[PDB]
């Protein structure tokens, strides 16, 4: 309960858990750390370790904001990057298998800020959280738990709406057969290299990409034994 | 062929007996033959004079009965020093070693001018044997004393194969001539000169006992006892012409020793007849002739091998009971000769001796059976078959060797009922000399009569017999029996045939003008339950007519009131055993569920012409590609379903059959996944489009799949038909398989490992799910009891939260392997039967060393070849020189379908696969321990929950049970489709989900059938978690933890325990109530 | 076929000629008769195998075979009428009175008197 | 009722 921050730098920032009947002071605590990145989507972001279960982007701004009025600070969060709760998104099989439509740790993710003002007004800020729990435990904010997404993944056995689905298909395959035809028109458009080399393309093919990964997946029959008047010699020799 | 000969050379050197024992008891033995020459002569006494003597004598004369009265016995007593000779294997040096013993047969000859010629008659002969031995223990006891070896020395009487009219003294040693370690009994058998009765009066057809009736029982015990010394001579010579004679010969003991074969008497019940004795001389037989043109069938050059399968060959092919009988000359070529004395006969014509009068026509039936089937084990190739041959015991358990076990309570059971006792008489007496002998016969009869075609094989045991009795005594006493009737009670155990054992209806002699004798014993037989009855195609035959039950067989009726008529009408016949696993089985909400037969498919066949109705609607439409074919993949179309389907039942977990619907081949499909998965439901929505306007009595929506890792854009067409039945259809295209192979070879090298995983349930899916339901249903209607055993199988593991991770299809295929592979058993045909096998097979099955493969094929092509099983016999071994200690994989089950063998079996966390087979070994070691009673099987299907680490107790809004089609009911869907959540079970899904979460840190289970497992009201679910060891102790904290922890120091943290609650109580809401750490 | 039931099945198929063709006939050169003639007995084995001989039925019904067939010989040459002309049935299996009363999708008598 | 040990290092086998 004195522990406010790991050495290595991660500011726990513990929380009070729901009351619910099943479960007649028990706490969750989440570890911190300021994220540097040259990566612009992943710069303005905090690194956050053990989040509570299903922990979306309305959550936190539940907390940012619960924060913010009890230290007066102006912080506003813009997205939650990288969360894989169940490790669902840890692969873009869409990326392996085309280019078309896809150009392209666990238990963590990474909490982007709105600007450089407001991430170091919440670290300011989480920084006097943690010293609550050594003093003053009954402070400590509460995670609600409860949200309209949480609805969503909880209703399992709900049949998908018949009108959203028609929409989305007919919206993804339209942007499909353009991105498949462009792509047909570019091979077969006699492609010649600056200092004047057509590239070769067959009949049929259809993307740039297919062609380049075709290539990376990809004289003794016709020697006589018995031609010249060495190899008769030789095999004189070895026939004695 | 050599393999199999370097095994036959390893086992006989371990059973080898160790030499040192023989001179043990050679040092032995041969000092008690001087004790024997040293009991002194004695004088003729009537019966009045032995009795005065024995009068005051511990010992007591072991008179067989009826034992000798006054006026019968005016022949008079005598005692002279006997021929004394060894005998038995240990004459012939064909013992082994035995942990329970073995048994040194001593032979003692009475001199010939103690008998007279015709002592053969009225027991005559007998009872001077019965004093010549009573008088012999007198004076070899005190002698005992004397040379003071009584110390460790006990004595005790019994009966020769526990042949009632031949008594013996048994000799053994308790804790220098003590021979205990050697684990050796001295047999004394009192025997005849031989040929001291003519021969041809002492024929099976004769009589020997006045009162007329054959005595066929009582003339072999007094011939065969004249017969012991020239059947040893006729070994010995055999023994030396061939030189493999003897290893032959515990090749053949092994074999009936494991079946449970003895040499014993089976007229009072127990199975037996043959033994090493009967194999010997059998082979002897064959050696010298054996065919119709007694032509040669064994020859002496033939090796251990050989010679043991020509034996079993005979056995298997020709009969010796019914048609056809061998004769041979043991002083001359054996012939078969093709008539028959509708008993087993191996007749002797040098001495008039037939060997197997021992034996029942029962158990020669069963023998025909195992040498049959161990004749086809022997005859394979492709695996091995030592093992199952020789190094397996099928007798340790009734339930396992017998489909259905009885146990008949005889009324007045401390004399059998006067009535009972009455219809014994004194004609039956001269057939059959004891009353078990009697009952025995009387019970087979009748109940092989009244079962008929319904049963293989019957057998009736006289359970709790006993062979010895103290030299106090001159009868077996038992504690019910009161020296009436050596046994407690008999219990009848069946082979049932399952293509008729649930057949409603009895056929009999068909009508005639004058009644024919078949006709007339039918109709006394049923009695009031025989009836004349018509049919459709016009026959007219006496026929009786019983209902079928969901909680017993037909035979239990049977049975029941068959053996009640004739038998006693105050007999007790139960079988519980069966009526509990038949309980426990779901009982679907049909009409007349009750009346149903578990051998009933009608459910399954309703729900299939559903679907046909539904097929034709589908091609019949009109779509921009032609539909290639559309193939049932559901549980319920490979009768495997826990529950049977039943009409608007849509709780049931399995309700939603899974259908694959294949469109033809065409170019247009896209190339990149999404895309493609998108193009399926493009088509879905025009199939449900046409479906709702057409069809509007038809029922449809979406719903989503997930069960393919990362593809998460399957959306599957969910059709609620009008009769009841839900399908769920999802579109294979060709395109798809070489779209995730592009996957795989794009992948980066340390996601490749992942990226196969995903195609490994998609295949497991489309492509292997197709095969698996194709095979399942074709070899199932051949194996009837298979449909049942697995659902069965199914409710157990889910009982014990063992299904959430176990994939069905894994189920079937080790509930299939006692079918497929019976050997060493036979094919299960009953419920109990079947259940128990597969048990016992999980239970021995060590799956780190030993892969489980199966020839899904019907009783004899698919069958595996020698080329495909030792190719997945390498696949294992690749698999296992990765992968030694089990970790990755566990169960290695391959096939025609699936040749990898990791199909249906990865994924499986290893504490999962330790629970199953832990939990196997316990039930049969409970079952061991105590008999199969109605507390075994509840404790078989009552689940501990005291391992988990938490309990967490979950009980839904409404009960499920009702929903499921559960008879402990909805009649139409629901009209907004959003309400049939409202009448689900979401707990399985809240733990596929938590899983993921805590794969690195918690293995959580839960049971996926509520409706079946949850109470009365099926409404009350649990999960169980377990904290692996690692994280259970606190760690040091790095960002790699993947955990949920709570600090305890700067750098050491601890599973947040309290915490993880908190996650799974709300999932739950008001689903959650009690929490038990 | 995956119930042990030995069959012998009969294609017949012929060339056509393409919309713009002008020349009268439409004959193939033998290399491109043996090529479909591989093609065709390939997909013909695969679906027998595949399949038992009540799903074999249920394919010829649909004339599903033909069309699969002209999709894969429809790089080689064109083709019109493909059938599948005729199946013989040469060897069966013990008889199983189970499975076929499973295909069709047990009866008391009446007491005469 | 049936219950057994949870084994970890299949020492079961
Ligand atoms: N069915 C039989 N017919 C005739 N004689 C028999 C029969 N069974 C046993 N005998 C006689 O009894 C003697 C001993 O029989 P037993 O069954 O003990 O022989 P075994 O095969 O040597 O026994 P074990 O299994 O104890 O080694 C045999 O040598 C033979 O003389
Ligand atoms: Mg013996």
Known sequence: ?240 | ?1077 | ?113 | SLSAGFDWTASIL
Not at chain 2, 460 to 479: A, C, H, L, W
Not at chain 2, 527 to 539: A, E, M, V, W
């Open chain 2, 1 to 1077: 062929s050599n393999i199999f000969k370097l095994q036959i050379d390893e086992l006989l050197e371990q059973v080898k007996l160790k030499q040192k024992h023989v001179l043990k008891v050679e040092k032995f033995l041969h000092k008690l033959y001087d004790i024997l020459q040293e009991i002194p002569d004695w004088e003729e006494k009537s019966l009045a004079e032995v009795d005065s003597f024995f009068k005051n004598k511990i010992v007591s004369v072991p008179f067989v009965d009826p034992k000798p009265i006054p006026q019968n016995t005016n022949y008079k007593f005598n005692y002279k020093k006997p021929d004394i000779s060894l005998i038995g294997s240990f004459a012939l040096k064909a013992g082994i070693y035995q942990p329970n013993g073995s048994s040194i047969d001593t032979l003692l000859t009475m001199p010939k001018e103690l008998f007279e010629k015709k002592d053969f008659l009225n027991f005559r002969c007998l009872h001077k044997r019965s004093v010549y031995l009573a008088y012999l223990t007198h004076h070899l006891l005190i002698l005992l004393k004397k040379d003071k070896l009584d110390s460790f020395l006990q004595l005790e009487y019994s009966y020769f194969d526990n042949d009632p009219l031949l008594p013996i003294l048994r000799i053994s040693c308790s804790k220098d001539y003590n021979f205990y370690k050697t684990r050796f009994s001295i047999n004394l058998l009192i025997g005849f000169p031989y040929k001291v009765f003519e021969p041809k009066k002492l024929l099976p057809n004769r009589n020997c006992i006045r009162i007329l009736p054959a005595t066929p029982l009582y003339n072999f015990s007094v011939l065969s006892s004249s017969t012991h010394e020239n059947y040893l001579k006729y070994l010995y010579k055999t023994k030396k012409q061939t030189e493999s004679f003897v290893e032959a010969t515990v090749l053949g003991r092994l074999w009936l020793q494991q079946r449970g074969f003895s040499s014993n008497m089976s007229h009072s019940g127990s199975l037996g007849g043959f033994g090493t004795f009967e194999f010997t001389i059998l082979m002897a037989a064959l050696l010298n002739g054996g065919g119709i043109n007694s032509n040669k069938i064994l020859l002496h050059g033939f090796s251990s091998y050989q010679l043991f399968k020509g034996v079993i060959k005979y056995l298997a092919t020709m009969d010796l009971c019914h048609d056809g009988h061998l004769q041979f000359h043991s002083n001359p070529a054996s012939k078969y000769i093709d008539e028959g004395f509708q008993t087993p006969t191996l007749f002797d014509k040098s001495t008039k001796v037939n060997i197997l009068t021992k034996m029942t026509v029962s158990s020669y039936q069963i023998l025909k059976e195992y040498a049959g089937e161990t004749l086809r084990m022997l005859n394979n190739v492709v695996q091995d078959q030592f093992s199952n041959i020789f190094l397996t015991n099928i007798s340790r358990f009734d339930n396992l060797k017998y489909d259905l076990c009885y146990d008949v309570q005889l009324p007045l059971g401390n004399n059998l009922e006067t009535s009972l006792a009455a219809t014994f008489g004194s004609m039956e007496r001269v057939k059959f000399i004891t009353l078990e002998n009697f009952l025995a016969h009387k019970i087979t009869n009748v109940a092989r009569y009244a079962l008929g075609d319904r049963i293989k094989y019957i057998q009736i045991e006289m359970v709790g017999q006993k062979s010895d009795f103290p030299i106090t005594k001159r009868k077996v006493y038992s504690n019910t029996g009161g020296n009436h009737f050596n046994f407690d009670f008999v219990r009848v155990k069946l082979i049932v045939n399952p293509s008729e054992c649930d057949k409603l209806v009895t056929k009999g002699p068909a009508h005639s003008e004058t009644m024919s004798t078949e006709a007339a014993v039918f109709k006394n037989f049923w009695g009031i339950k025989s009836s004349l009855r018509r049919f459709k195609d016009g026959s007219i035959t006496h026929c009786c007519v019983w209902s079928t039950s969901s909680s017993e067989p037909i035979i239990s009726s049977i049975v029941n009131f068959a053996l009640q008529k004739h038998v006693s009408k105050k007999a007790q016949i139960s079988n519980e055993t069966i009526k509990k696993f038949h309980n426990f089985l779901p009982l679907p909400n049909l009409p007349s569920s009750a009346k149903t037969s578990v051998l009933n498919l009608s459910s399954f066949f309703n729900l299939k012409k559903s679907f046909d109705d539904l097929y034709k609607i589908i091609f019949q439409m009109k779509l921009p590609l032609s539909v290639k074919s559309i193939l049932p993949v559901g549980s319920a179309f490979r009768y495997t379903s826990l529950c049977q389907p039943v009409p608007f039942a849509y709780s049931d977990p399995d309700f939603f059959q899974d259908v694959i619907l294949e469109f033809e081949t065409s170019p247009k499909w896209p190339d990149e996944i999404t895309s493609l998965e998108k193009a399926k439901t493009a088509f879905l929505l025009k199939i449900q489009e046409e479906l709702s306007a057409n069809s509007s009595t038809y029922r449809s929506f979406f719903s989503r799949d997930e069960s393919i890792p990362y593809n998460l854009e399957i959306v599957t067409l969910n059709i609620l038909t009008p009769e009841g039945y839900g399908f769920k259809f999802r579109v294979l295209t060709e395109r798809d398989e070489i779209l995730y192979l592009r996957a795989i070879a794009n992948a980066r090298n340390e996601l490749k490992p992942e990226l196969e995983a995903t195609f490994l349930k998609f295949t497991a899916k489309y492509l292997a799910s197709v095969r698996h339901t194709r095979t399942l249903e074709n070899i199932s209607h051949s194996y009837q009891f298979y449909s049942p055993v697995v659902r069965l199988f199914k409710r157990w593991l889910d009982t014990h939260l063992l299904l959430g991770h176990i994939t069905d299809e894994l189920a079937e295929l080790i509930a299939i392997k006692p079918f497929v592979d019976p050997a060493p058993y036979f094919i299960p045909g009953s419920l109990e039967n079947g259940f128990l096998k597969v048990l016992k097979f999980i239970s021995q099955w060590n799956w780190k060393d030993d892969p489980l493969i199966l020839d899904l094929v019907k009783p004899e092509s698919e069958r595996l070849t020698l080329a495909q099983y030792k190719g997945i016999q390498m696949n294992f071994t690749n698999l296992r020189n990765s992968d030694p200690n089990g970790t990755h994989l566990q169960f290695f089950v391959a096939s025609k379908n699936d040749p990898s063998g990791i199909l249906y079996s990865s994924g499986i966390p290893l504490p999962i696969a330790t629970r199953l087979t832990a939990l196997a070994k316990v039930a049969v070691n409970l079952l061991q321990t105590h008999g199969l009673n109605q507390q075994t099987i509840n404790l078989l299907f009552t689940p501990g929950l005291k391992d988990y680490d938490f309990v967490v107790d979950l009980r839904t809004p409404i009960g499920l049970k009702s929903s499921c089609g559960i008879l402990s009911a909805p009649s139409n869907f629901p009209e907004n489709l959003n309400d049939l959540s409202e009448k689900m079970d979401p707990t399985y899904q809240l733990v596929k989900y938590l899983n993921l979460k805590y794969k690195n840190s918690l293995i959580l289970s839960s049971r996926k059938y509520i409706g079946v497992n949850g109470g009365e009201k099926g409404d009350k679910n649990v999960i169980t978690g377990l904290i692996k060891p690692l994280f259970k102790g606190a760690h040091k904290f790095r960002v790699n933890l993947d955990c949920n922890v709570k600090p305890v120091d700067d750098e050491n943290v601890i599973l947040n325990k309290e915490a993880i609650f908190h996650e799974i109580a709300a999932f739950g809401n008001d689903m959650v109530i009690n929490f038990e750490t």
């Open chain 3, 1 to 113: 076929t995956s119930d042990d039931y030995v069959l012998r099945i009969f294609a017949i198929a012929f060339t056509r000629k393409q919309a713009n063709q002008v020349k009268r006939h439409s004959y193939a050169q033998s290399s491109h008769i043996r090529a479909i003639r591989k093609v065709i007995s390939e997909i013909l084995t695969k679906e027998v195998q595949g399949s038992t001989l009540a799903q074999l039925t249920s394919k010829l019904i649909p004339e599903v075979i033909n069309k699969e067939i002209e999709n894969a010989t429809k790089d080689i040459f064109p083709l019109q009428n493909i059938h599948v002309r005729k199946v013989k049935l040469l060897k069966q299996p013990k008889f199983d009175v189970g499975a076929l009363m499973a295909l069709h999708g047990e009866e008391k008598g009446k007491k005469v008197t």
């Open chain 1, 1 to 240: 309960e004195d522990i406010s921050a790991m050495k290595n730098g991660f500011i726990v920032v513990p929380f009070k858990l729901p009351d619910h009947k099943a479960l007649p002071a028990s706490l969750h605590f989440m570890f911190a750390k300021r994220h540097q990145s040259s990566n612009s989507n992943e710069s303005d972001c905090l690194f956050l370790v053990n989040l509570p279960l299903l922990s979306n982007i309305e959550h936190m701004k539940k907390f940012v904001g619960q924060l913010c009025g009890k230290y007066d600070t102006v912080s506003h969060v813009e997205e939650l990057l990288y969360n894989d709760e169940f490790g669902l998104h840890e692969v873009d099989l869409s990326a392996l298998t085309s280019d078309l439509m896809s150009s392209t740790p666990r238990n963590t993710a990474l909490l982007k800020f709105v600007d450089a003002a407001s991430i170091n007004n919440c670290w300011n800020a989480l920084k006097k959280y943690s010293n609550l729990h050594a003093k003053h435990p009954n402070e400590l904010f509460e995670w609600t738990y409860t949200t309209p997404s949480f609805t969503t993944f909880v209703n399992f056995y709900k049949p998908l709406d018949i009108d959203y689905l028609k929409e989305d298909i007919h919206t993804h395959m339209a942007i499909f057969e353009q991105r498949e035809a462009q792509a047909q028109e570019d091979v077969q458009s006699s492609i010649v290299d600056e200092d004047g080399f057509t590239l070769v393309v067959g009949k049929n093919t259809k993307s740039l990409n297919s062609i380049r990964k075709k290539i990376l997946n990809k004289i003794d029959k016709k020697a006589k034994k018995d031609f010249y008047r060495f190899q008769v010699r030789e095999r004189k020799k070895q026939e004695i």
